[PDB]
Design a protein around this ligand. Structure first.
Ligand SMILES: *[C@@H]1O[C@H](CO[C@@H]2O[C@@H](C)[C@@H](O)[C@@H](O)[C@@H]2O)[C@@H](O[C@@H]2O[C@H](CO)[C@@H](O)[C@H](O)[C@H]2NC(C)=O)[C@H](O)[C@H]1NC(C)=O
Ligand SMILES: *[C@@H]1O[C@H](CO[C@@H]2O[C@@H](C)[C@@H](O)[C@@H](O)[C@@H]2O)[C@@H](O[C@@H]2O[C@H](CO)[C@@H](O)[C@H](O)[C@H]2NC(C)=O)[C@H](O)[C@H]1NC(C)=O
Ligand SMILES: NC(=O)c1cc[n+](COC[n+]2ccccc2/C=N/O)cc1
Ligand SMILES: NC(=O)c1cc[n+](COC[n+]2ccccc2/C=N/O)cc1
Ligand SMILES: CC(=O)N[C@@H]1[C@@H](O)[C@H](O)[C@@H](CO)O[C@H]1O
Ligand SMILES: *[C@@H]1O[C@H](CO)[C@@H](O)[C@H](O)[C@H]1NC(C)=O
Ligand SMILES: CC(C)OP(C)(=O)O
Ligand SMILES: CC(C)OP(C)(=O)O
Lengths: 530, 533
């Protein structure tokens, strides 16, 4: 029996497993329960701390994936299946995972906490691309990841009600962070040095923990990759959240009293809720999600945009960034004329139709303003330019400009901000070439997946992965990604400097789509208000 | 005794002209031909009545008076502004036209160019040195005609619906002159079946309005619009705001001591011309540049609809048009109001002055509209660079008032049956007195079209003289054939798709695409939708 794999946390004793990496072994503790199972009468409720157990919990394998939709658009295609659940679905899914060096550190080691994305409707800490073993070995950190409830199970809200208060998926996240403060030292982690990082909706979650004071005392630094809490998709108002909750009840046969409605919802099998999620959205769209964080004055006392504009952020360091082609990948899920299997060279009619799906629920004037800004009026009908322009519409509106607004406001209000654009297209990427560097495909390099010898990454790509892990770990340890080489300067509201990340050395550039984002961040909001 | 070449009989009676020397030889000039009864006293604000026939010989031997108008005094003595000021006495007796013809007079019918001067509809005169027709006629053997038309309140004060001041009488002055050309130009050797209108700024807007007014449209065959268009935001006014401006002007001068229109105009008729001129600008609703108090009114008569509606719903098959602008249309207007601008310093403005200048350059729009403008003309990587802000504000005024109205006209006319040719004039004259940051200012291609560099008393470059000759041939080729090209780089027609135009400078012709297409898409396609919602 290996004493390195035995740990006592506050709930009781755990048994881990030793794993192999190309650089040596690490210790993993997978499937640690941090909450009571949110089942039966506990569905839709805030999580409760896991009650202590006797005996030894087997922490040698990943636990169940929270109930969620499973993408079936390209069945068997590696580009989509890499994001689908790789374990059984269950409502009993509130488990977290700890990777540490082997033997376990005996000095307080910086902690990285990963929050997966997936539009608040999907995701799992057990996916291959989130394997913490390489970061922990290469950079000598403790890495924690948790499962949190998605879809209606995590974000169905009847605001004002006690039976479905909303944001419980975020509270699952907060509870795991409290678990880390109380327990991570038992694994050799330093609770006074916790860096949150997440991608997409995970980045938005990180941003929301930055703006919720009860969360702010649980971590020290933040990394937001391709997501932001001020995204048009990341939050929903109380009125619309109530409408969506009520509509889903009607769709699954529950008439239409909040108490009656949640009680009837709790009798439905989880899969039934999943099957009807999607039909509560008001219009055809891409990059919008049914059940997302609700601004009800509690977890978020105001909208993230209002909280960002009014916040003092001195003493905060954040790392934020984007991939080169944020929108390209969302277009195959609803923009007319698009497909992974052809060049998606669309007509102007399809482009104009794509703008309404990509910018849903706005006035015709707002839509025409988008068309004006993203049309080259010397080549208004060129299919290649139109495909690229629609990809830029979706990417700028949902990712690049929300991230750029966040970066600019925090920098100008006291935070030290580092910005990147990930510009390397993996040699193993199965998506077509016209998609460029699609959303989500920097994660595998951050986690050091290319070091896995059973994968087909090149030698320079492995070096690149090691470069990225060092930047991320430098930031986690000091608030500065630079090795203490061409220096990575902080992002500021004036100079707007960022670096491009690829196989070539660092190149400093100015402006995160400055011209496009002035439209989304400065003008379009005022058009909608008047 | 008498030179038979300088004696002509038109319908009103006999005329005596003058023989002018040019660098290339003799030209016959008939200057100051009366074409209307003097619009004075009881005829103030009325449409022009045709000139009654006369006995004996009228001496048409010098330029007649300039129509009463404001005289610019911003830079007194500065030639850059004095060249546009009246060079004859001011008078309400000013409805005279000028005819230049080859010496000897042509024996076969000769194409006719008719010039309409600009000046924001408040100023201008056919007698300005820069409009001297002797060089075009000598170089290209055409007949050139120019007329005076009433400006300011005298030409465009409108109490719509009233008979005592119907408005647009300045445009009727132009129309009467065009009717005179049809009835009389053959007596000078001109061909009334080949008349080409050309004009600049408000003259270009005037030319476009004659295109859109059926009674005028039968009086000419081709059109040249230089740095102006009838659909410009400054070129027309609605009936209500025209009535408000007329009523306020009357109130400012003492009329009435105004319900009844007859009575109010009668009181206006007793006021000295200069007093009307002195108060004319006080009726503008706001502090602005490129906006003019009294301008053509859309009242259903001369223009049955707005020029933009008539342009869109018009069939222009069989019509040839030549349109263009200078490289820096807006820079010249900024020293007349924009904060921080002057011809005597570099006018490197701050961001606050840029934002203040936008409201002056784009007057009377919602704050939302103003901020759409700020968004499109800000470089968000260099939001406060003074030199970039100076150029941005110049582009705002130039795009909004000239380039984009011209581009919209060129595009709609091309797509609806007209053959269009477009240019951008990019030569900065060696004799230019305005500062270097202004580039090629508004109005400073005219002297090259009229061949002014060929005057030996002026110190133009020898290369600029060749340039002038090249431009006069383009214009005259268009007047003769509807095509500026010679019967050598080809000047392609402008179309709504390819949007090709040529650059005019000392270099050979260069074909380019798009008359500030991205900018004009904002002014021509989006901004009107915002002003509606
Ligand atoms: C690119 O593909 C889209 C999607 O069509 C599907 O995928 C193709 C690869 C092929 O397998 C098709 O048979 C599939 O239907 C095309 O858009 C569709 O076009 C068809 C007409 O053939 C039409 O009936 C569908 O409604 C269209 N659907 C969408 C979402 O646009 C598109 O035309 C292709 N572009 C090309 C070939 O240039
Ligand atoms: C550039 O000049 C403008 C115009 O001012 C006039 O011309 C100058 C050369 C100088 O002789 C001034 O005294 C003239 O009045 C300047 O803008 C003016 O500034 C003064 C005082 O600062 C102010 O009272 C006026 O209202 C301003 N006029 C306008 C139209 O804004 C400007 O400051 C000069 N810029 C420099 C010198 O950098
Ligand atoms: N619960 C659902 O029914 C459901 C279905 C589909 N989607 C989204 O489609 C899957 N998807 C998967 C991967 C990338 C994008 C997308 C679409 N985004 O709008 C969300 C929820
Ligand atoms: N009738 C008048 O009093 C009057 C006063 C001022 N202006 C304008 O003169 C300024 N100005 C003079 C020359 C060229 C442009 C400009 C400005 N245009 O906005 C016209 C008429
Ligand atoms: C034409 C009109 O209605 N306006 C009146 C007119 O009838 C009247 O003759 C005149 C007397 O001065 O005053 C004015
Ligand atoms: C330049 O022009 C002026 C007037 O246009 C003239 O008096 C002068 O002789 C010319 N030449 C020189 C060298 O100044
Ligand atoms: C949908 C996922 C992949 O992107 P984010 C919005 O979470
Ligand atoms: C003021 C004059 C030069 O401009 P145009 C509009 O006539």
């Amino acid at each position: 029996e290996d004493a390195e794999l035995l740990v006592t946390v506050r709930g009781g004793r755990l048994r881990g497993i030793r794993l192999k990496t190309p650089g040596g072994p690490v210790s993993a503790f997978l499937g640690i329960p941090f909450a009571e199972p949110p089942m039966g009468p506990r569905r839709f409720l805030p999580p409760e701390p896991k009650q202590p157990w006797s005996g030894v919990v087997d922490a040698t394998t990943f636990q169940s994936v929270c109930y969620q939709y499973v993408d079936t658009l390209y069945p068997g295609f590696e580009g989509t299946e890499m994001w689908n659940p790789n374990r059984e679905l269950s409502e009993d899914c509130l488990y977290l995972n700890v990777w540490t060096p082997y033997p376990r550190p005996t000095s307080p080691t910086p902690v990285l906490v990963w929050i997966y994305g997936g539009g608040f409707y999907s995701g799992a800490s057990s996916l291959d691309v989130y394997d913490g073993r390489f970061l922990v070995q290469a950079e000598r950190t403790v890495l924690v990841s948790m499962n949190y409830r998605v879809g209606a199970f995590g974000f169905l809200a009847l605001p004002g009600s006690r039976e479905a208060p909303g944001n419980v998926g975020l509270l699952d996240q907060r509870l795991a962070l409290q678990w880390v403060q109380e327990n991570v030292a038992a694994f050799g982690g330093d609770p006074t040095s916790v860096t949150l990082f997440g991608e997409s909706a995970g980045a938005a979650s990180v941003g929301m923990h930055l703006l919720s004071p009860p969360s702010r005392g649980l971590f020290h630094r933040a990394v937001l990759q391709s997501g932001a809490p001020n995204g048009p998709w990341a939050t929903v108002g109380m009125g619309e959240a109530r409408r969506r909750a009520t509509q889903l009840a009607h769709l699954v046969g529950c008439p239409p009293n909040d108490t009656e409605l949640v009680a009837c919802l709790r009798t439905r099998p989880a899969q039934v809720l999943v099957n009807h999620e999607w039909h509560v959205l008001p219009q055809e769209s891409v990059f919008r999600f049914s059940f997302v964080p609700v601004v009800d004055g509690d977890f978020l006392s105001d909208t993230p945009e209002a909280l960002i504009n009014a916040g003092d952020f001195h003493g905060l360091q954040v790392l934020v960034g984007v991939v080169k082609d944020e929108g390209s990948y969302f277009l195959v899920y609803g923009a007319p004329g698009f497909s992974k299997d052809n060049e998606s060279l669309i007509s102007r009619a399809e482009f104009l139709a794509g703008v309404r799906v990509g910018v849903p629920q706005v006035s015709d004037l707002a839509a025409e303003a988008v068309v004006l800004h993203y049309t080259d009026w010397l080549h208004p009908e060129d299919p290649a330019r139109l495909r690229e322009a629609l990809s830029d519409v979706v990417g700028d509106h949902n990712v690049v400009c929300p991230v750029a607004q966040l970066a600019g406001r925090l920098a100008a209000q006291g935070a030290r901000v580092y910005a990147y654009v990930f510009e390397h297209r993996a040699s193993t990427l199965s998506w077509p070439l016209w998609m460029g560097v699609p959303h989500g495909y920097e994660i595998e390099f951050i986690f050091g997946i290319p070091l896995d010898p059973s994968r087909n990454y090149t030698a320079e790509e492995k070096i690149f992965a090691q470069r990225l892990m060092r930047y991320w770990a430098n930031f986690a340890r000091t608030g500065d990604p630079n090795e203490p080489a061409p220096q990575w300067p902080p992002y500021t509201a004036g100079a707007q400097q960022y670096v491009s990340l690829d196989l070539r050395p660092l190149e400093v550039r100015r402006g995160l789509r400055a011209q496009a984002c002035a439209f989304w961040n400065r003008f379009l909001p005022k058009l909608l208000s008047a």
